[PDB]
Paper text:
The interaction site between Pfs48/45 and Pfs230 was delineated at 3.4 Å resolution. Our structure indicates that Pfs230 engages with all three domains of Pfs48/45 through its terminal 6-Cys domains, Pfs230D13 (296 Å2) and Pfs230D14 (1376 Å2). Pfs48/45 adopts a disc-like conformation in our structure with Pfs230, with Pfs48/45D1 (1057 Å2) and Pfs48/45D3 (478 Å2) accounting for the majority of contacts with Pfs230, while Pfs48/45D2 (112 Å2) contributes more modestly. Pfs230 binds to Pfs48/45 on the opposite face of the disc conformation compared to the C-terminus of Pfs48/45, where the GPI linker is located for attachment to the PPM. Additionally, the Pfs48/45 N-terminus wraps around Pfs48/45D1–2 and, through residues 41–50, forms interactions with loops 2993–2998 and 3108–3114 and strand 3007–3014 of Pfs230D14. While the N-terminal region of Pfs48/45 remained largely unresolved in previous structural studies of Pfs48/45 without Pfs230 implying flexibility, this region is well-resolved in the Pfs230-bound structure and reveals that unlike other A-type domains, Pfs48/45D1 features a different β1 orientation and connectivity, localizing to the interface. An analysis of single nucleotide polymorphisms (SNP) across P. falciparum revealed that the interface between Pfs48/45 and Pfs230 is highly conserved. Given that Pfs48/45D1–2 contributes 1169 Å2 of a total 1647 Å2 buried surface area within the Pfs48/45-Pfs230 interface, it is conceivable that Pfs48/45D1–2 is sufficient for Pfs230 binding, allowing for Pfs48/45D3 to retain a range of motion in the complex. Membrane-anchored Pfs48/45 forms a disc-like structure and interacts with a short C-terminal peptide on Pfs230 that is critical for Pfs230 membrane-retention in vivo. Furthermore, we could not find evidence of a Pfs230-positive population in Pfs230ΔCterm gametes in a flow cytometry-based binding assay using over 2,000 macrogametes. Together, our structural and in vivo experiments demonstrate that the C-terminal region of Pfs230 is essential for the formation of the Pfs230:Pfs48/45 complex.
Two sexual-stage surface proteins essential for Plasmodium transmission, Pfs230 (5) and Pfs48/45 (6), are expressed in both gametocytes and gametes. Pfs230 contains fourteen 6-Cys domains, whereas Pfs48/45 contains three. Here, we report the molecular structure of the endogenous Pfs230:Pfs48/45 heterodimer in complex with six antibodies with potent TRA as determined by cryogenic electron microscopy (cryo-EM).
Residue numbers in the entry:
A (entry chain A): 2044 to 3118
B (entry chain D): 30 to 430
Write the structure that this text describes.
């Protein structure tokens, strides 16, 4: 009857290799844990039954142990199990009030594998009794007990002080999220000494990682009630604000993990600076596919000031995420310098063009020529266009490679948007810069200056050595270098979870608890360093190296002075930096970055201003070419592990017939390759300046070696004849691979057919750049391009208007109209339909669409896509797929009302498709579409409930908390009416106006067709912006009846009263906007 | 049944509309934006019958750089657009007008002006919203202007007085003494504006009648105890009985309005074989009796300083586009949908007196022109039936431009 190995902030009871609690002792052997305060609880039990872990430490003498249950202990892991009265078990996540971090671990040195059982305590208000047994199993009648365990978690919280967002269930539940609904809200309110927790549903993971140890720098205001002041360093009651050494700064050749863990980091230290009791699952949460990503933390007792921040769940399978708002309820700023006094401002960028083939002085002498030509076509459309701007350019021009541009959001220029007002110091400012950048565009952001950390180490190295730091721990497909107490085996996965931020090398670990590390600069910034690397995401931090695959960090340039040298991308050290937007991007998710300023070294919201910057990046849908060597490593992992079903990569990864080291890549124009090799591991580093040539000797080339690529002779073209600009700067050790591209036209003069150049990477894989006569035949047959300007069809009795598309670019037909442009001018209420194929239909197996979606990515400016609702609100969308003919159709009915001249373009392309006829090859073609609308007529006689639609509906009801309305509408024949309600709302009755109440018939639900057979209908259940709309038009109805609808919600209701009556109260003014 | 005239224009929820919005969130904001560079004119060139023209501006506390010129518009307005010469709006000679300044919204300030059709002379006043001084990275803002050319109504005013108040500036052609047996009957010429003064009128004053089928284009509005009745440009019969009831002095006064019948020869085209219909057309070219799908056309032309003409088209079948709310742009070798344009913009007149009728399968589209067009204009309406098409063209070469 005693206690165990309770270790205050850590809890452990090791029965595997602990002399205290091992079978070696012939006396009482048991342990007890009074766990508490969001701290880990480790149980390191012996092997129960022959398990596939190791041998020797699990010899025959040590193998006769067994106790129920012997469940799965490999990489696949279920919730930790706790034994009960019946000698059976129950899940620990329910035995205790919501356990998290239930993972198994083993020791590696000398193969001392043991079934380590770690789990982090959740909020608990009572003393919970969990009891185990430890039993020896030699054989029947020889089963003898030798110990037991007893977990006795204690009270540490109260129901009132604990707030939780159980995202699994509720109106805000994230499970129901789909392609149409992406996010739902939740919040936790915490006053002095409160408790907050997060629990993403199964299938989600918590981001940003290390939360809440480091969180957003949103708000920071002091409170007079505080009893202890703040220091911002490792001193006082906090233990953070130091940087790693032996994980990222000290590397060796054998370290191959550098680019595989650049996922999420770089968050600020405020919560640590604020003494917050932060607990996190590090960068590797539970196996969330069958577990809940959960975390907990507590408000510090001695600290009562104001802070704001948030963290998010995430899942890319359905583009669904959930935001978690965290704030201090003790908001002691409700009257001074709060959100009301926070001035909101906006900024526009300065635009230039990147030096794709130019140098420094060219920035002033030559890039003007590049800049002064692109916008001429946009000017032509703005002014010259009168009917329709077809693609009449068919000689002496190129488009794809010339669209590169550069954008800059300088705040040192616009000091007013980030600095305090010179005299009106009674307010604080907030600013937001918007950049609508596109592919092949360099984005460089300028902000105030703030520098990085500077760790230190000290020790009297003499007559002493530290050789007890050689051990690793393996769990969940990964091996970690960590440390263990020699006797008590007291450590933590929390230490492992934070090991991404710390490391130990040599013998210098003297007095770490007292550190006052500071930056070399004073100004506040978020993130502290490399903002363009750890890009902000509004209220979320992510690393751009892995989040945006293929991104290149471009060197900063404050000034090209006489002392200029090879600078770097480090921000905000010099306040300048640059990145490149890859042509291919996984998703359209936008990114941000924060900038700030202050007066002294210890400032806050009382003496600081906040600025924001926005840069948009386009998505992509077509897979890249090239070999991903890390994908070959993933294949070897698939050999290693079995639960890697999600084997998805963004590269086609062309495969040789028998060989894997070979990468037979064909240099095809109008294609992008993605050969992925870490940093400059590509060998030779001068490649392709120095390459090795092998010849077509073996068609499969199964018998090849990478080391052979060292002895070859080259006398063709030359060595230094063509030079390009720098596109890889290894100064940042987290840079991506080089990019290779080609223009719209290609030349056949310099090709070598029966020989291939090669380069090597990872010492195993071989790159092969080949060219085939098929490409030359394709270009020689496709160069002769014919363009036809056709017109569409229509009807007036039905008010229909549609074009013919699919019958034009068939690749199995002889072409005399290799390209066709379709322009069709429409008006209000016109139902446009677009028929296009996919990359599966016969003769269309390689069809792709540009822009990347007809419904949400149309073009508004020349070669610059934008959503339809951003400039053409109230547009109905319906994308469908045919059952048999593999035909994709879209509906693009124009909104009833338009206030300005409108003309947008959206194209198609089938040049990648071909077919074989009579042993001859017939290739694909290209097509384009243009639409013209102009203003509308008889603006909607209804009411809007979203505000932004104020120019489309007569009434614009801006929603307010617990609002009510009576939208009475009286319309006649040929009169347009409708309403718009928020998507999150529910239409009661459903499907209005399709089925509506009756004003006079006791609000009886009546079908729209039954009410009047001449009523055309069209509905928008949801749209991208998040609104719901309904449309109705009456056409020559010989009756005057009434009906009603109602938009309803928990905190908002809107009633629509409708009566049909011919009338005219318009003098036809039709307010004339010259635009 | 009976209510004061002014109450008939308040029977609407929310707002009545017809606002020149130049706020930051308005129709065309003046903020520096790369998305637009052209000038802004919310011009409404037309007669005004107590019509509401409203200017929406951002709050100065939110946009101090946003200027209002004149600062008290519409209380003070400009008369010289090029020179911006400020004069009090009352000095313009506007008759029985009123202005409002509504600021019951934290997001914007509203200015509303109502103008009566009783100005003795044509009045043109301008208000300017200037944001070009917003120097953001040397990106100047845009300028907006509200053009309100209050044209004196181009017809005589037949005013009848049945109130205890005096209208100083009205002709006062008729009064209570002219009501025989509490009934007054008057004749109105094509387009004449009839005005009745009465404190208590029926809600259907001049809105209903016995033979007023030809009188429906009227934009009947009520204000200052006055009921304004804008006669349509064209009628087909003399007996167009439009009735109203006034309760002045507790007496059931009856007012009857009828046209000064003079059928206007339509300076248009008639593609229908029914050349003896209720309408008369200058040009006629029957679609029938035409074989081999032979196309027909008729080039109608008009040219006069002032226009009191009737232009329209009569043809069997369907008109593509459905004239006259949309008509083809004449500039094309083939007048296909690519040339679709609004007639209100094609001939630069928004006061077109539309008049549509149908006889069996014959679609008749007519519209009246009063005044003059600032520029020479032309339009074409195509009539198609089965396999044959008829081309209608009007060229209105007014003495302008």
């Amino acid at each position: 009857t005693a206690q165990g190995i309770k270790h205050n902030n850590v809890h452990l009871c090791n029965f595997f290799d602990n002399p205290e609690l091992t079978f070696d002792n012939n006396k009482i052997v048991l342990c007890k844990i009074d766990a508490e305060l969001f701290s880990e609880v480790i149980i390191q039990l012996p092997i129960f039954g022959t398990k596939n872990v190791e041998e020797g430490v699990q010899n025959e003498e040590y193998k006769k142990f067994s106790l129920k249950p012997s469940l799965v202990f490999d990489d696949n892991n279920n919730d930790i199990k706790v034994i009960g009265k019946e000698k059976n078990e129950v899940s620990i996540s329910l035995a205790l009030k919501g356990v998290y971090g239930n993972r198994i671990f083993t020791f590696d040195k000398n193969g001392k594998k043991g079934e380590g059982i770690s789990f982090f305590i959740p909020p608990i208000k009572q003393d919970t009794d969990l009891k185990f047994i430890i039993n020896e199993t030699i054989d029947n009648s020889n089963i003898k007990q030798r110990g037991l365990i007893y977990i006795f978690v204690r009270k540490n919280v109260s129901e009132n002080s604990f707030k939780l967002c159980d995202f699994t269930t509720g109106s805000t539940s994230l499970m129901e999220l789909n392609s149409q609904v992406k996010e739902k809200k939740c919040t936790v309110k915490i006053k002095k000494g409160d408790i907050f927790g997060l629990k993403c549903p199964k299938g989600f993971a918590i981001f940003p990682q290390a939360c809440f140890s480091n969180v957003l720098l949103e708000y920071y205001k002091s409170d007079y009630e505080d009893s202890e002041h703040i220091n911002y360093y490792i001193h006082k009651d906090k233990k953070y604000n130091l940087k790693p050494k032996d994980v990222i700064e000290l590397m060796d050749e054998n370290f191959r993990e550098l680019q595989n863990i650049q996922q999420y980091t770089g968050i600020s230290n405020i919560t640590d600076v604020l003494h917050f009791k932060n607990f996190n699952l590090g960068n590797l949460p539970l196996n969330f596919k069958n577990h809940y990503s959960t975390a907990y933390a507590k408000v510090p007792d001695t600290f009562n000031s104001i802070i704001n921040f948030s963290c998010n769940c995430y899942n890319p399978e359905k583009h669904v995420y959930g935001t978690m708002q965290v704030e201090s309820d003790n908001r002691n700023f409700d009257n001074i310098k709060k959100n009301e006094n926070v001035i909101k401002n906006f900024l526009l960028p300065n635009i230039e063009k990147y030096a794709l083939l130019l140098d420094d002085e060219e920035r002033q002498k030559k890039i003007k020529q590049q800049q002064e030509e692109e916008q001429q076509e946009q000017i032509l459309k703005d002014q010259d266009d009168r009917l329709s701007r077809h693609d009449d350019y068919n000689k002496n021009h190129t488009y794809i490679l010339y669209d590169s541009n550069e954008h800059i959001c300088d705040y040192e220029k616009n000091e007013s948007l980030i600095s305090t007002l010179p005299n009106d110091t009674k307010k604080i400012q907030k600013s937001i810069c918007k950049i609508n950048a596109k592919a092949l565009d360099v984005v460089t952001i300028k902000c105030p200056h703030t520098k990085n950390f500077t760790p230190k180490d000290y020790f009297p190295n003499s007559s002493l050595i530290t050789n007890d730091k050689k051990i690793v721990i393996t769990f969940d497909k990964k091996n970690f270098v960590t440390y263990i107490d020699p006797t008590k085996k007291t450590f933590s996965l929390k230490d492992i979870y934070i090991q991404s931020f710390y490391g130990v090398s040599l013998d210098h670990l003297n007095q770490i608890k007292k550190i006052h590390e500071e930056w070399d600069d004073v100004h506040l910034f978020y993130p502290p360093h490399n903002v363009l690397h750890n890009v902000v995401l509004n209220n979320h931090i992510v690393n751009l190296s892995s989040a945006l695959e293929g991104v290149l960090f471009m060197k900063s340039k404050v000034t090209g002075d006489e002392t200029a040298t090879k600078k770097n991308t480090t921000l905000p050290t010099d306040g300048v930096s640059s990145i490149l937007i890859p042509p291919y991007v996984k998703e359209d998710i936008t990114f941000h970055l924060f900038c700030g300023k202050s007066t002294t070294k210890k400032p806050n919201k009382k003496n600081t201003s906040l600025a924001l910057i926005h840069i948009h990046i386009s998505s992509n849908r077509n897979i890249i070419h090239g070999c991903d060597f890390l994908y070959l490593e993933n294949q070897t992992n698939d050999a290693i592990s079995n639960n890697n079903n999600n084997s998805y990569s963004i590269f086609t990864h062309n495969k040789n017939t028998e060989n894997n080291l070979i990468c037979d890549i064909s240099l095809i124009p109008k294609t992008v390759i993605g050969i992925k090799c870490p940093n400059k591991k590509l060998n030779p580093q001068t490649c392709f300046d120095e390459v090795y040539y092998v010849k077509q000797e073996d068609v499969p080339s199964k018998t090849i070696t990478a080391d052979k690529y060292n002895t070859f002779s080259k006398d063709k073209i030359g060595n230094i004849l063509k030079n390009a600009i720098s596109i890889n700067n290894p100064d940042e050790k987290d840079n991506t691979y080089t990019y290779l591209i080609l223009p719209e036209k290609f030349e056949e003069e310099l090709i070598d057919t029966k020989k291939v150049l090669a380069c090597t990477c990872d010492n195993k894989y071989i790159i092969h750049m080949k060219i085939e006569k098929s490409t030359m035949d394709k270009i020689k047959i496709d160069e002769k391009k014919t363009i036809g300007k056709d017109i569409c069809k229509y009807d007036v009795t039905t008010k229909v208007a549609t074009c013919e598309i699919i019958d034009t670019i068939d690749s199995s037909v002889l072409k005399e109209h290799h390209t066709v442009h379709y322009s069709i001018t429409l008006s209000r209420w016109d139902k446009l339909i677009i028929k296009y194929p996919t990359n599966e239909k016969t003769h269309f197996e390689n069809f792709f669409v540009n822009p990347f979606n007809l419904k949400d990515k149309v073009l508004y400016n020349y070669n610059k896509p934008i959503n339809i609702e951003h400039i053409l609100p109230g547009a109905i969308t319906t994308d469908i797929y045919d059952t048999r003919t593999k035909i994709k159709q879209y509906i693009l009915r124009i909104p009833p009302y338009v206030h300005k001249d409108i003309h947008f373009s959206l194209e198609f392309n089938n040049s990648l498709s071909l077919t074989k006829q009579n042993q001859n090859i017939i290739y694909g073609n290209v097509a384009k579409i243009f639409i013209h609308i102009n203003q509308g007529y008889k603006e909607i006689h209804g009411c809007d409930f979203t505000g932004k639609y104020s120019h489309l509906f007569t009434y614009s009801k801006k929603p307010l908390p617990n609002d009510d309305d009576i939208c009475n509408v009286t319309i006649g024949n040929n009169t347009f009416s409708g309403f718009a309600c928020l998507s999150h709302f529910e239409l009661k009755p459903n499907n209005c106006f399709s089925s509506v109440y009756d004003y006079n018939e006791a609000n009886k639900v009546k079908k729209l067709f039954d009410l009047s057979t001449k009523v055309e209908l069209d509905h928008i259940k949801q749209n991208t912006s998040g609104y719901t709309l309904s449309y109705i038009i009456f056409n020559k109805e010989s009756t005057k009846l009434k009906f009603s609808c109602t938009c309803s919600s928990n905190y908002s209701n809107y009633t629509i009263r409708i009566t049909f009556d011919p009338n005219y109260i318009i003098p036809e003014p039709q307010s004339r906007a010259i635009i | 049944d009976f209510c004061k005239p002014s109450s008939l224009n308040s029977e609407i929820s929310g707002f009545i509309g017809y606002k020149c919005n130049f706020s930051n969130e308005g129709v065309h904001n003046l903020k520096p934006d790369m998305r637009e560079r052209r000038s802004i004119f919310c011009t409404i060139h037309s007669y005004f019958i107590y019509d509401k023209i409203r200017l929406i501006i951002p709050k100065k506390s939110s946009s101090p750089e946003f200027k209002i010129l004149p600062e008290k518009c519409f209380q003070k307005v400009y008369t010289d657009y090029e020179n911006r010469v400020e004069t009090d709006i009352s000095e313009l000679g506007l008759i029985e007008y009123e202005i409002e300044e509504n600021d019951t919204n934290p997001n914007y300030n509203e200015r509303t002006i109502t103008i009566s059709p009783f100005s003795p002379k044509d009045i043109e006043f301008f208000c300017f919203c200037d944001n070009t001084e917003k120097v953001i990275s040397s990106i100047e803002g845009r300028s907006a202007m509200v053009h309100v050319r209050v044209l004196k109504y181009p017809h005589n005013i037949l005013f009848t007085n049945l109130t205890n108040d005096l209208f100083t500036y009205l002709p006062k052609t008729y009064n209570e003494s002219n009501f025989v047996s509490n009934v007054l009957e008057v004749e109105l010429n094509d387009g004449e504006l009839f005005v009745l003064a009465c404190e208590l009128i029926n809600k259907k004053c001049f809105q209903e009648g016995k033979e007023k089928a030809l009188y429906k284009s009227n934009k009947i509005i009520y204000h200052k105890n006055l009921t304004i009745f804008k006669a349509p440009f064209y009628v087909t019969s003399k007996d167009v009985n439009t009735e109203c009831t006034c309760k002045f002095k507790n007496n059931n006064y009856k007012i009857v309005l009828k046209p000064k019948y003079e059928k206007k020869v339509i300076h248009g085209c008639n593609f229908s074989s029914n050349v003896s219909s209720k309408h008369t057309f200058t040009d006629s070219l029957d679609i029938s009796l035409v074989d081999d799908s032979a196309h027909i056309s008729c080039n109608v032309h008009l040219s006069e300083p002032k226009y009191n003409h009737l232009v329209g088209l009569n043809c069997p079948g369907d008109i593509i586009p459905d004239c006259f709310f949309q008509v083809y742009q004449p500039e094309s070798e083939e007048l296909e949908p690519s040339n679709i344009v609004y007639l209100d913009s094609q001939i630069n007149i928004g006061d077109i007196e539309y008049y549509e009728d149908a006889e069996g399968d014959d679609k008749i589209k007519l519209f009246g022109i009063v005044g003059s067009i600032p520029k020479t204009t032309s339009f074409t309406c195509i009539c198609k039936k089965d396999k044959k098409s008829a081309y209608m063209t009007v060229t209105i070469d007014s003495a302008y431009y």
